[PDB]
Amino acid sequence: AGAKDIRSKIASVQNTQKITKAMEMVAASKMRKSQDRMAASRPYAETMRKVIGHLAHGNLEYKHPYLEDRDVKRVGYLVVSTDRGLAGGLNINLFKKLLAEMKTWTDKGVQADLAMIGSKGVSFFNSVGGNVVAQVTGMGDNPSLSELIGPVKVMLQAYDEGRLDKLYIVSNKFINTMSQVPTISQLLPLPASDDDDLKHKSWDYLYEPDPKALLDTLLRRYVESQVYQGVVENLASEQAARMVAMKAATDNGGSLIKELQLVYNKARQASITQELTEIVSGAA
Amino acid sequence: AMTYHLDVVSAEQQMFSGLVEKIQVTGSEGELGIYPGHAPLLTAIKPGMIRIVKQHGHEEFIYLSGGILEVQPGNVTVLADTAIRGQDLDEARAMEAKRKAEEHISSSHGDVDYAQASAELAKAIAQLRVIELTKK
Amino acid sequence: VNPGISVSRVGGAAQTKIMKKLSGGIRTALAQYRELAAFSQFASDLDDATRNQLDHGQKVTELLKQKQYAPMS
Amino acid sequence: VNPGISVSRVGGAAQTKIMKKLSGGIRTALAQYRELAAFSQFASDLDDATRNQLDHGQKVTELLKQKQYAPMS
Amino acid sequence: LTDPSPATTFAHLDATVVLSRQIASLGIYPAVDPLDSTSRQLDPLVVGQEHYDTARGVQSILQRYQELKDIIAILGMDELSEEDKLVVARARKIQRFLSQPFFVAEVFTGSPGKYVSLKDTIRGFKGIMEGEYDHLPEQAFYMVGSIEEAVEKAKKL
């Protein structure tokens, strides 16, 4: 209505604000489960670095294969991407800062190697272009290291092969519930944890094998569970700002309701007006 | 039987925990006498179920996926490789991941909220004919 | 009919201890099973709150309908 | 002009056997193209099939024109 | 409009004009509404497609950012393909560029603006048509001198 329009319309704005309110709620529970779940993945990676040093004082006296990570041809890169929507703009935040870093590598001019995970930035860096030797996408909410395997030894070649010297590693996170940390790292650094590698393993740990093997695979474990945590927090951020935007969009329609209040209210008055007009006129 | 703070951890989250006076298994080395009182040492174990005297005589066989376990002096905890990382596999699906790069591969989160949502996206976003109603 | 949108001046004013007293909690609870149904679709997973309400109110809601030519004792 | 908002009862009856013959698909893209149009309503909603409905719908849409001064052969 | 003053008026006039709150609402130095105004003398023959074509692109781009107003309003403009941002880009920019120095401005706008020749209008018409500079702010475009004058801006501004 209004006249036939502003109210049918404005009502559509009710369907709007309502709809996106249900969005605020949906994406809210999403947020809560999102971070709540998103906190899990730390434990054994934490262990891995911890002990890694711990021996690695005395143990570090032997050898570091990946102390270069990959050898210097590329400074590699890594992409995660959206399986869903409404979360937030780390396509802009992360993909922006990402393109930026890319410019920094062009500044370097050294080679670089990226791999898409997630669907979106698979479609950004697809769109935006780049080198993704592997492209992964849209695992949904489930981070799975075994799912990561195909990608894991996907990259593990060139890095292991010494192709991509450093690398780039970008992971969103919820910095707070509020604050959401899009993160981007220089990957394929020697992650270089010497911490408990200060104190010679004071418990002299009989080592069934030699260390460097566990350096490779076990290291993959540490950084990997690290990845599960980081992408998880990316989900914390995700469903967080999801709820946020969901709410704000739930908000927008009110002003419209005001205007249509001026077509049905103002043009209400107008209808009244013509009513007077031809009421008189035909009434003569 | 409880001794030495026997924990079980995994990447995403710790597997289990306790104090197990005896842990009955055969190390990747070989038959491993279930014991309290073993020295600082490093270990790994294939998948399978290991009875253990754990806290208060509670001995149980617990299947594994393959994974690593060791004891600092007196320090007991367990890590399970979620599985043994697939030989090739990860490297075979590397080719996939590469083919996935090469021959595009994409997945998504399709929530009935995301789905029914997008329904409201075309749908709700469509059917705004007041889009012309405002002016200046 | 419109549920309490129909609004009578009299109402349970004439209703009895069973009727006034015992029969009380209707319309708002109705609004519940209504409102409890409400969010369910877009934002989902209504617990046995709304399930055990909206449906309980959808079940009782079902018990409501009285066909044409139905008087009530 | 506004098609299908343009509605004339005489119609392609006078379209001769081929004109009679070939005249069909019009409202189709009036649907289809415009139907294809609907996909935009959700940002990034399209399908390769629908992409063909903007190939016929939108591309075949790109087909038609009539000038400021148009004869027709 | 339906006022036969305006309504009936549309009849007799060769070219229609509007002095409007629109470019005033836009704050443009013009402070008027052209967008409907018809120069009957504009023949794509006459205009060429210099003026003719450039004009058609106006009809579109008009409909373009014009259209964008809707959903941009809806969700914010986030949902857009960037190409929209190219349209609204040349909208703020080029649209602004239309806003021009005109000598008489000196009175109303204490500063005189500039006489503006048409060949340049085809020129910059290409430029922003090219989005050639693309650097010049819509501001420099706003109340612009000619393409170069707004490009002289683009240097400074």
XYZ file of C-alpha atoms in Angstrom:
723
model
C 0.000 0.000 0.000
C 1.116 3.412 0.746
C -0.772 3.541 -2.458
C -0.746 -0.177 -3.280
C 3.009 -0.030 -2.921
C 4.643 1.525 0.133
C 3.007 -0.993 2.428
C 3.144 -4.146 0.361
C 6.720 -2.938 0.028
C 7.344 -1.837 3.616
C 5.902 -5.170 4.672
C 8.500 -6.733 2.454
C 10.845 -4.660 4.604
C 9.286 -6.431 7.567
C 10.047 -9.765 5.988
C 13.461 -8.191 5.577
C 14.286 -7.060 9.096
C 12.630 -10.177 10.455
C 14.497 -12.414 8.052
C 17.852 -10.928 8.931
C 16.925 -10.988 12.597
C 16.526 -14.730 12.376
C 19.881 -14.286 10.688
C 21.317 -12.535 13.730
C 20.157 -15.444 15.877
C 21.168 -18.232 13.525
C 24.583 -16.702 12.947
C 24.748 -16.102 16.699
C 24.445 -19.723 17.786
C 26.744 -20.173 14.827
C 29.176 -17.780 16.474
C 28.997 -19.431 19.889
C 29.435 -22.961 18.649
C 31.890 -21.420 16.205
C 34.495 -20.172 18.647
C 33.469 -22.657 21.326
C 34.338 -25.399 18.905
C 37.048 -23.201 17.433
C 39.220 -23.415 20.543
C 39.874 -27.127 20.488
C 42.772 -27.908 18.251
C 45.778 -26.723 20.268
C 46.720 -29.604 22.532
C 49.072 -31.947 20.715
C 50.714 -29.295 18.561
C 51.409 -27.462 21.806
C 52.974 -30.649 23.091
C 54.918 -30.980 19.854
C 56.702 -27.653 20.073
C 57.132 -27.989 23.823
C 58.981 -31.288 23.785
C 60.488 -30.307 20.441
C 62.593 -27.765 22.195
C 62.742 -29.838 25.340
C 64.922 -32.494 23.867
C 66.068 -30.056 21.248
C 68.552 -28.504 23.591
C 70.792 -31.513 23.669
C 68.842 -32.955 20.758
C 69.281 -29.810 18.668
C 72.989 -30.644 18.499
C 72.263 -33.049 15.623
C 70.630 -31.629 12.470
C 67.812 -29.405 11.175
C 66.532 -30.384 7.712
C 63.870 -27.712 7.418
C 65.937 -24.982 9.054
C 65.594 -23.507 5.579
C 62.092 -25.006 5.182
C 62.110 -25.054 1.400
C 65.167 -23.733 -0.364
C 64.967 -20.323 -1.959
C 63.247 -20.190 -5.299
C 59.806 -19.229 -4.198
C 58.692 -17.655 -1.005
C 55.569 -19.756 -0.902
C 51.984 -18.894 -0.027
C 48.773 -20.449 1.243
C 45.070 -19.718 0.795
C 42.003 -20.577 2.855
C 38.599 -19.582 1.583
C 34.889 -19.356 2.272
C 32.644 -22.412 2.260
C 29.668 -20.281 3.327
C 28.585 -16.675 3.674
C 27.452 -13.862 5.994
C 30.536 -14.147 8.234
C 32.546 -11.097 7.272
C 34.876 -9.320 4.884
C 38.228 -11.037 5.359
C 37.952 -11.502 1.664
C 38.711 -7.806 1.820
C 40.695 -7.845 5.039
C 42.645 -11.014 4.416
C 42.445 -11.049 0.622
C 43.346 -7.374 0.582
C 46.312 -7.699 2.919
C 47.066 -10.807 0.904
C 47.316 -9.055 -2.439
C 49.416 -6.553 -0.525
C 51.883 -9.180 0.651
C 51.994 -10.449 -2.922
C 53.122 -6.986 -3.931
C 55.788 -7.282 -1.254
C 57.022 -10.488 -2.861
C 57.104 -8.801 -6.241
C 59.129 -6.166 -4.451
C 61.237 -9.135 -3.505
C 60.602 -10.371 -7.030
C 61.470 -13.829 -5.787
C 59.189 -16.637 -6.788
C 56.154 -17.433 -4.665
C 53.830 -20.415 -4.471
C 50.280 -20.376 -3.123
C 47.684 -23.065 -2.636
C 43.960 -22.452 -2.398
C 42.021 -23.820 0.497
C 38.399 -22.952 0.900
C 36.172 -22.040 -2.011
C 36.252 -18.233 -1.991
C 39.945 -17.314 -2.156
C 40.178 -20.307 -4.374
C 37.991 -17.943 -6.396
C 39.857 -14.831 -5.270
C 43.352 -16.005 -6.147
C 41.620 -17.764 -8.978
C 40.174 -14.388 -9.946
C 43.008 -12.281 -8.537
C 45.269 -14.817 -10.168
C 48.395 -16.317 -8.693
C 50.135 -19.647 -8.336
C 48.221 -22.270 -6.366
C 49.894 -25.599 -7.066
C 47.205 -27.244 -4.992
C 43.736 -25.803 -4.626
C 41.617 -26.953 -1.714
C 38.165 -25.701 -0.977
C 35.261 -25.409 1.379
C 35.735 -28.114 3.981
C 32.878 -26.402 5.795
C 33.276 -26.202 9.541
C 35.285 -29.368 9.768
C 39.037 -28.875 9.846
C 40.509 -32.307 9.258
C 44.247 -32.898 9.149
C 43.713 -36.115 7.213
C 41.575 -34.087 4.857
C 44.601 -31.813 4.843
C 46.807 -34.758 3.879
C 46.319 -34.522 0.134
C 47.085 -30.875 0.567
C 49.662 -31.698 3.244
C 51.951 -33.678 1.001
C 50.714 -31.528 -1.848
C 52.798 -28.723 -0.436
C 55.241 -31.001 1.353
C 56.843 -31.685 -1.992
C 58.044 -28.231 -3.011
C 58.763 -27.137 0.533
C 60.440 -30.457 1.224
C 61.743 -30.120 -2.337
C 63.125 -26.835 -1.245
C 61.179 -25.004 -3.900
C 59.487 -22.246 -1.918
C 61.989 -20.748 0.517
C 59.715 -18.985 2.907
C 56.018 -19.125 2.372
C 52.925 -17.114 3.066
C 50.391 -18.431 5.530
C 47.085 -16.597 6.003
C 44.519 -17.669 8.610
C 41.562 -15.731 9.888
C 40.782 -15.897 13.573
C 38.471 -14.186 15.983
C 40.975 -11.892 17.649
C 38.336 -11.362 20.284
C 34.818 -12.526 20.055
C 34.540 -8.984 18.768
C 38.039 -8.613 17.395
C 38.520 -11.068 14.555
C 42.141 -11.795 13.654
C 42.708 -12.303 9.975
C 46.261 -13.522 10.133
C 48.888 -13.923 7.438
C 52.270 -15.467 8.091
C 55.576 -15.851 6.418
C 55.325 -19.560 6.113
C 58.230 -21.872 5.304
C 60.397 -20.003 7.691
C 62.284 -22.329 9.798
C 59.550 -22.104 12.435
C 62.625 -22.256 14.641
C 61.578 -23.159 18.176
C 64.717 -23.333 20.317
C 62.852 -22.644 23.550
C 62.982 -25.883 25.483
C 65.943 -26.437 23.195
C 67.646 -24.300 25.806
C 67.617 -26.891 28.574
C 69.383 -30.088 27.547
C 66.802 -32.770 27.867
C 67.431 -33.333 31.531
C 65.388 -36.455 31.361
C 67.635 -38.243 28.945
C 65.052 -39.633 26.610
C 66.078 -42.881 25.029
C 65.239 -42.286 21.383
C 64.086 -45.364 19.498
C 64.723 -43.575 16.184
C 66.874 -40.629 15.266
C 65.164 -37.248 15.583
C 65.136 -35.769 12.093
C 62.389 -38.090 10.870
C 60.043 -36.924 13.591
C 61.329 -33.492 12.677
C 59.735 -33.886 9.262
C 56.532 -35.769 10.026
C 56.053 -34.751 13.652
C 56.769 -31.157 12.671
C 53.983 -31.490 10.132
C 51.916 -32.540 13.137
C 52.750 -29.471 15.235
C 52.199 -26.854 12.554
C 49.201 -28.831 11.334
C 47.203 -28.972 14.561
C 48.263 -25.360 14.806
C 46.436 -24.968 11.500
C 43.305 -26.664 12.811
C 43.296 -24.191 15.688
C 43.926 -21.199 13.444
C 41.279 -22.001 10.853
C 38.964 -22.849 13.727
C 39.418 -19.337 15.079
C 38.831 -18.218 11.503
C 35.435 -19.803 12.065
C 35.099 -18.012 15.387
C 35.588 -14.743 13.544
C 33.414 -16.152 10.808
C 30.164 -16.929 12.556
C 30.895 -14.048 14.900
C 30.749 -11.281 12.321
C 28.144 -13.463 10.661
C 25.863 -12.824 13.597
C 26.972 -9.197 13.496
C 26.186 -8.375 9.879
C 23.101 -10.544 10.274
C 21.895 -8.192 12.986
C 22.719 -4.967 11.148
C 20.923 -6.096 8.016
C 18.093 -7.031 10.355
C 18.225 -3.348 11.227
C 18.319 -1.503 7.908
C 14.641 -1.726 6.906
C 13.260 0.509 9.641
C 13.997 3.781 7.877
C 12.107 2.495 4.865
C 9.242 1.682 7.194
C 9.437 5.362 8.073
C 9.254 6.543 4.481
C 6.415 4.218 3.544
C 4.955 5.557 6.725
C 5.074 8.739 4.707
C 3.405 7.219 1.662
C 0.711 5.371 3.539
C 0.673 8.014 6.219
C 1.454 10.978 4.021
C -0.262 9.573 0.986
C -2.810 8.384 3.494
C -3.408 12.044 4.158
C -3.310 12.451 0.395
C -5.966 9.824 -0.167
C -8.011 11.687 2.406
C -7.222 14.766 0.378
C -8.598 13.611 -2.959
C -11.431 12.061 -0.999
C -12.242 15.602 -0.001
C -11.481 16.774 -3.521
C -13.896 14.746 -5.629
C -16.096 14.251 -2.606
C -16.704 17.934 -3.141
C -16.377 17.767 -6.909
C -18.876 15.034 -7.667
C -20.658 16.383 -4.621
C -20.427 19.629 -6.605
C 46.616 -49.292 38.539
C 47.618 -45.648 38.796
C 51.189 -44.603 38.439
C 52.975 -41.846 36.546
C 50.274 -39.516 35.329
C 49.337 -41.313 32.134
C 47.748 -38.902 29.662
C 46.552 -39.398 26.086
C 46.653 -36.399 23.768
C 45.761 -35.804 20.157
C 46.094 -32.873 17.795
C 42.561 -31.507 17.766
C 42.221 -32.499 21.404
C 43.809 -34.799 23.939
C 42.801 -38.425 23.497
C 42.607 -39.486 27.154
C 44.544 -39.395 30.403
C 45.066 -40.865 33.832
C 47.762 -42.515 35.881
C 48.597 -46.002 34.757
C 50.885 -48.035 36.923
C 51.199 -50.553 34.102
C 50.776 -49.917 30.403
C 50.579 -53.266 28.664
C 51.629 -53.008 25.035
C 54.473 -53.887 22.701
C 56.473 -50.845 21.725
C 57.395 -50.234 18.119
C 60.648 -51.686 19.416
C 58.952 -54.808 20.731
C 57.218 -56.271 23.751
C 57.048 -53.433 26.254
C 56.815 -54.537 29.863
C 53.963 -52.630 31.453
C 55.683 -50.743 34.157
C 55.912 -47.858 36.467
C 59.499 -46.785 36.841
C 60.771 -46.703 33.269
C 63.378 -44.071 32.397
C 63.263 -40.943 30.246
C 62.799 -42.317 26.762
C 61.168 -41.600 23.418
C 58.620 -43.855 21.731
C 56.043 -44.415 19.017
C 53.417 -47.098 18.537
C 51.342 -48.417 15.682
C 47.547 -48.591 15.843
C 45.990 -51.047 18.240
C 44.515 -51.785 21.646
C 46.740 -51.821 24.719
C 45.431 -53.034 28.034
C 46.913 -50.940 30.791
C 46.696 -51.033 34.500
C 45.559 -47.451 34.898
C 44.304 -45.680 37.942
C 43.106 -48.130 40.588
C 43.718 -51.426 38.862
C 41.697 -50.352 35.865
C 43.340 -52.114 32.965
C 41.877 -51.607 29.544
C 42.827 -52.310 25.946
C 42.497 -49.182 23.822
C 42.736 -49.352 20.032
C 45.090 -46.928 18.317
C 45.450 -45.361 14.878
C 49.210 -45.284 15.013
C 50.835 -42.398 16.788
C 53.672 -41.411 19.055
C 54.244 -41.833 22.782
C 57.183 -41.230 25.130
C 58.067 -40.593 28.756
C 60.239 -37.871 30.076
C 61.595 -39.116 33.367
C 58.412 -39.990 35.245
C 56.438 -37.941 32.723
C 53.751 -39.922 30.923
C 51.423 -38.732 28.174
C 50.191 -40.193 24.876
C 49.767 -38.820 21.354
C 47.792 -40.517 18.602
C 48.495 -39.640 15.033
C 44.876 -39.258 13.990
C 46.001 -41.768 11.460
C 49.352 -42.575 10.031
C 49.631 -39.836 7.433
C 48.805 -41.636 4.221
C 51.882 -42.563 2.234
C 51.473 -41.146 -1.221
C 47.852 -40.367 -0.507
C 48.586 -36.942 0.835
C 51.183 -37.081 -1.933
C 48.756 -38.876 -4.223
C 45.975 -36.490 -3.322
C 48.707 -33.923 -3.694
C 48.277 -34.639 -7.379
C 44.595 -34.394 -6.682
C 45.144 -31.169 -4.712
C 47.280 -30.247 -7.688
C 44.656 -31.605 -10.058
C 42.258 -29.943 -7.634
C 44.258 -26.866 -8.436
C 44.627 -28.049 -12.031
C 41.132 -29.457 -12.520
C 39.280 -27.080 -10.246
C 38.008 -28.533 -6.973
C 35.660 -26.704 -4.624
C 33.569 -27.465 -1.539
C 31.222 -25.380 0.589
C 29.151 -24.991 3.754
C 25.527 -25.285 2.683
C 23.669 -24.642 5.916
C 19.876 -24.650 5.767
C 20.517 -21.249 7.264
C 22.976 -20.467 4.470
C 20.657 -22.250 2.043
C 17.253 -21.063 3.199
C 19.141 -17.816 3.633
C 20.181 -17.477 -0.005
C 16.599 -18.382 -0.761
C 15.877 -15.230 1.173
C 18.741 -13.632 -0.763
C 17.437 -13.821 -4.272
C 13.920 -14.170 -2.922
C 13.976 -11.633 -0.109
C 16.476 -9.418 -1.926
C 14.462 -9.872 -5.074
C 10.958 -8.516 -4.936
C 12.008 -5.116 -3.721
C 10.158 -2.825 -6.103
C 10.333 0.006 -3.587
C 13.974 0.080 -4.737
C 12.809 3.045 -6.807
C 10.594 4.560 -4.105
C 13.228 6.773 -2.434
C 14.560 9.932 -4.120
C 16.492 13.238 -3.746
C -10.533 -16.777 13.122
C -7.881 -14.290 14.226
C -6.621 -15.545 17.605
C -7.337 -12.929 20.227
C -7.165 -10.359 17.536
C -10.771 -11.141 18.213
C -11.113 -9.267 21.505
C -14.310 -9.428 23.542
C -15.214 -7.029 26.321
C -16.747 -9.806 28.421
C -14.700 -12.980 28.199
C -13.932 -15.201 31.149
C -15.746 -12.606 33.208
C -18.585 -15.039 32.858
C -16.272 -18.043 33.121
C -16.450 -20.325 36.140
C -14.029 -21.848 38.611
C -13.380 -24.568 36.073
C -13.899 -22.112 33.255
C -12.410 -18.936 34.668
C -10.118 -20.649 37.126
C -9.255 -24.004 35.632
C -9.301 -23.015 31.951
C -7.093 -19.910 32.134
C -3.800 -19.946 30.266
C -4.992 -20.054 26.673
C -4.286 -17.208 24.343
C -0.781 -16.178 25.364
C 0.303 -19.804 25.327
C -1.306 -19.859 21.903
C 0.895 -16.941 20.893
C 3.701 -19.145 22.148
C 3.111 -22.180 19.924
C 2.656 -19.565 17.253
C 5.701 -17.545 18.267
C 7.452 -20.760 19.251
C 6.869 -22.053 15.756
C 7.895 -18.607 14.554
C 11.680 -18.572 14.486
C 11.994 -22.272 13.777
C 12.506 -22.154 10.025
C 15.107 -19.472 9.330
C 16.979 -19.767 12.612
C 16.446 -23.412 13.431
C 16.944 -26.039 16.172
C 14.101 -24.960 18.431
C 14.681 -27.081 21.483
C 12.064 -29.049 23.320
C 11.268 -25.607 24.515
C 9.449 -24.764 21.314
C 9.220 -28.358 20.207
C 7.803 -29.279 23.580
C 5.907 -25.983 23.359
C 5.123 -24.996 19.763
C 4.406 -28.618 18.980
C 2.768 -29.189 22.334
C 1.027 -26.030 21.366
C 0.829 -27.378 17.843
C -0.584 -30.620 19.186
C -3.072 -28.920 21.482
C -3.391 -26.378 18.699
C -4.570 -29.324 16.642
C -6.961 -30.299 19.417
C -8.513 -26.860 18.999
C -10.338 -27.156 15.679
C -14.110 -27.502 16.039
C -15.944 -28.249 12.817
C -19.069 -26.552 11.600
C -22.158 -27.811 13.414
C -20.082 -28.645 16.492
C -21.485 -27.506 19.845
C -19.263 -27.973 22.908
C -20.109 -29.386 26.337
C 8.755 -1.353 -25.999
C 7.325 -3.413 -23.123
C 6.812 -7.001 -24.303
C 4.106 -9.198 -22.859
C 3.174 -6.060 -21.173
C 2.496 -5.644 -24.853
C -0.323 -8.100 -25.574
C -2.218 -8.157 -28.881
C -4.922 -10.689 -29.654
C -4.372 -10.934 -33.432
C -0.939 -12.526 -33.138
C 1.254 -14.633 -35.385
C -1.726 -16.313 -36.957
C -0.820 -13.926 -39.730
C 2.745 -15.177 -39.371
C 3.042 -17.298 -42.478
C 3.973 -20.947 -42.425
C 7.615 -20.293 -41.567
C 6.740 -17.167 -39.637
C 3.997 -19.380 -38.302
C 6.669 -22.044 -37.917
C 9.667 -20.352 -36.441
C 7.928 -17.800 -34.224
C 7.843 -19.737 -30.960
C 10.447 -19.047 -28.325
C 9.632 -15.407 -27.589
C 8.027 -15.399 -24.155
C 10.610 -18.078 -23.363
C 13.470 -15.664 -22.880
C 10.895 -13.139 -21.748
C 10.757 -15.813 -19.179
C 14.223 -17.242 -19.620
C 16.399 -14.167 -19.990
C 14.269 -12.426 -17.390
C 14.115 -15.765 -15.610
C 17.896 -15.793 -15.913
C 17.624 -12.252 -14.557
C 16.137 -13.585 -11.323
C 19.378 -15.418 -10.575
C 21.187 -12.134 -9.997
C 18.781 -11.438 -7.135
C 21.074 -13.590 -5.046
C 24.556 -12.214 -5.614
C 26.585 -14.958 -7.308
C 23.714 -17.449 -7.656
C 24.180 -18.605 -11.282
C 24.448 -22.041 -12.922
C 26.064 -23.051 -16.185
C 22.660 -24.225 -17.341
C 21.154 -20.909 -16.352
C 24.326 -19.482 -17.829
C 22.950 -20.973 -21.007
C 19.659 -19.324 -20.131
C 21.556 -16.075 -20.333
C 23.291 -17.433 -23.383
C 19.984 -17.881 -25.054
C 18.275 -15.684 -22.535
C 20.905 -12.995 -22.244
C 22.971 -13.709 -25.331
C 19.975 -14.419 -27.522
C 18.753 -11.337 -25.742
C 21.803 -9.607 -27.190
C 20.485 -10.808 -30.522
C 17.376 -8.740 -30.962
C 17.296 -5.077 -31.867
C 15.209 -2.568 -33.773
C 16.592 0.856 -34.564
C 15.343 4.387 -34.072
C 14.332 3.901 -37.701
C 13.979 0.187 -38.404
C 12.593 -1.446 -41.524
C 12.059 -5.223 -41.392
C 12.714 -7.532 -44.322
C 4.604 17.660 -13.357
C 1.002 16.745 -14.075
C 0.424 20.430 -13.618
C -0.586 21.390 -17.153
C 1.971 24.084 -16.566
C 4.567 21.308 -16.682
C 2.252 18.649 -18.115
C 0.843 20.670 -20.969
C 4.208 22.430 -21.130
C 6.072 19.343 -22.325
C 4.112 19.754 -25.544
C 5.155 23.121 -26.865
C 8.864 23.063 -25.982
C 11.601 21.826 -28.305
C 14.070 21.004 -25.526
C 12.953 20.497 -21.927
C 14.945 21.735 -18.921
C 14.700 21.534 -15.131
C 16.317 23.773 -12.495
C 16.283 21.299 -9.656
C 17.085 20.461 -6.071
C 18.674 17.362 -7.584
C 22.148 18.555 -8.527
C 21.469 20.828 -5.607
C 20.835 17.691 -3.575
C 23.949 16.617 -5.410
C 25.348 20.025 -4.564
C 26.599 20.179 -8.135
C 27.513 23.644 -9.348
C 24.554 23.270 -11.743
C 21.957 22.548 -9.024
C 19.471 21.275 -11.647
C 17.999 18.152 -13.251
C 19.047 17.502 -16.864
C 18.791 13.785 -17.021
C 15.457 13.807 -18.852
C 16.190 16.853 -21.015
C 16.039 16.156 -24.738
C 18.085 17.940 -27.349
C 16.045 17.168 -30.414
C 18.982 18.303 -32.578
C 21.356 15.569 -31.360
C 21.132 13.127 -34.324
C 23.548 10.178 -34.117
C 24.185 11.227 -37.643
C 24.647 14.789 -36.395
C 26.100 13.693 -33.062
C 28.078 11.134 -34.763
C 28.541 8.449 -32.261
C 31.051 10.733 -30.660
C 28.178 12.548 -29.075
C 25.654 9.892 -30.047
C 27.577 6.915 -28.716
C 28.938 8.739 -25.691
C 25.315 9.619 -25.006
C 24.092 6.038 -25.255
C 26.754 5.035 -22.772
C 25.204 7.720 -20.621
C 21.759 6.145 -20.911
C 23.254 2.866 -19.774
C 25.648 4.023 -17.047
C 22.750 6.093 -15.833
C 20.772 2.890 -15.603
C 23.899 1.243 -14.258
C 24.887 3.014 -11.078
C 21.245 4.073 -11.024
C 20.307 0.421 -10.801
C 23.082 -0.264 -8.296
C 21.429 2.179 -5.925
C 18.920 -0.549 -5.077
C 20.856 -3.504 -3.693
C 23.756 -1.319 -2.626
C 21.155 0.325 -0.450
C 19.956 -3.129 0.568
C 23.016 -4.882 1.934
C 25.426 -2.120 1.586
C 27.219 -2.412 -1.723
C 29.311 -5.383 -0.597
C 27.372 -7.996 -2.580
C 28.360 -6.327 -5.853
C 30.652 -7.591 -8.507
C 33.445 -5.056 -8.618
C 32.471 -3.939 -12.112
C 29.647 -2.122 -10.397
C 32.314 -0.324 -8.421
C 33.700 0.568 -11.826
C 30.342 2.064 -12.717
C 29.864 3.969 -9.462
C 33.533 4.749 -9.857
C 32.992 6.648 -13.076
C 29.790 7.809 -11.419
C 31.304 9.777 -8.586
C 34.314 10.516 -10.764
C 32.968 11.209 -14.234
C 29.560 12.332 -13.025
C 31.435 14.718 -10.793
C 33.522 15.756 -13.809
C 30.356 17.023 -15.431
C 30.137 19.468 -12.554
C 32.264 22.138 -14.029
C 33.883 25.514 -13.709
C 31.615 28.025 -15.445
C 32.722 31.658 -15.537
C 29.414 33.013 -14.284
C 29.900 30.910 -11.168
C 31.851 33.956 -9.929
C 28.636 35.577 -8.919
C 26.727 32.755 -7.264
C 29.873 30.798 -6.483
C 32.226 33.649 -5.727
C 34.759 32.054 -8.056
C 34.214 32.182 -11.814
C 34.533 28.924 -13.537
C 35.634 28.167 -17.051
C 34.174 28.158 -20.498
C 34.228 24.556 -21.708
C 34.593 23.441 -25.329
C 32.883 20.321 -26.636
C 35.753 18.648 -28.473
C 37.364 18.324 -25.068
C 34.078 16.868 -23.873
C 34.492 14.103 -26.413
C 38.127 13.919 -25.325
C 37.757 13.419 -21.599
C 34.572 11.605 -22.548
C 37.006 9.052 -23.853
C 39.308 9.536 -20.906
C 36.890 8.658 -18.142
C 35.188 6.530 -20.756
C 38.568 4.890 -20.779
C 38.612 5.676 -17.108
C 41.860 6.904 -18.559
C 43.272 8.790 -15.622
C 41.081 6.884 -13.166
C 43.339 8.580 -10.632
C 41.648 11.973 -10.520
C 39.305 12.126 -7.522
C 35.629 12.453 -8.176
C 36.369 15.667 -6.298
C 38.722 16.892 -9.009
C 35.978 15.703 -11.290
C 33.469 17.505 -9.086
C 33.104 21.066 -10.384
C 35.807 19.962 -12.804
C 37.537 22.175 -15.222
C 38.114 20.398 -18.506
C 39.625 16.919 -18.588
C 43.097 18.412 -18.402
C 41.912 21.089 -15.996
C 40.468 18.267 -13.963
C 43.620 16.376 -14.949
C 45.711 19.353 -13.902
C 43.747 18.804 -10.750
C 44.586 15.101 -11.030
C 48.214 16.172 -10.838
C 47.595 18.569 -7.984
C 44.175 17.151 -7.079
